[PDB]
């Protein structure tokens, strides 16, 4: 039982660390995503300005 318990507290900490890893990935994908927004604008006025 005790071993299980201490590994469950460690399980909580584990999943929290995993969330944080993901949050790093999501800041990165957030900025990448905003870049793609800017790109999309540049493609649209590339559309008009191609004429």
């Amino acid at each position: 039982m005790r071993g299980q318990i201490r590994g469950l507290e460690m399980a909580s900490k584990n999943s929290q660390d995993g969330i944080s890893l993901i949050q790093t990935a999501e800041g990165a994908l957030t900025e990448t995503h905003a870049i793609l927004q800017r790109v999309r604008e540049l493609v649209v006025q590339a559309g008009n300005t191609g004429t």
Binding site: V44, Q45, G47, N48, G50, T51
Partner: protein, 51 residues
Amino acid sequence: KNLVFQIGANATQQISVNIEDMGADALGIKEADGSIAALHSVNDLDVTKFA
């Protein structure tokens, strides 16, 4: 080479435009014509011909 301006933010949301004008902008069918209808804007006949 039609002027397909961008009008929206998605595909096929454009409008075409055309322009044609110059000296030889007189009467015609596909081309203007020869002695008539091209020079009538370029070289108006009222030279000595008209008499």
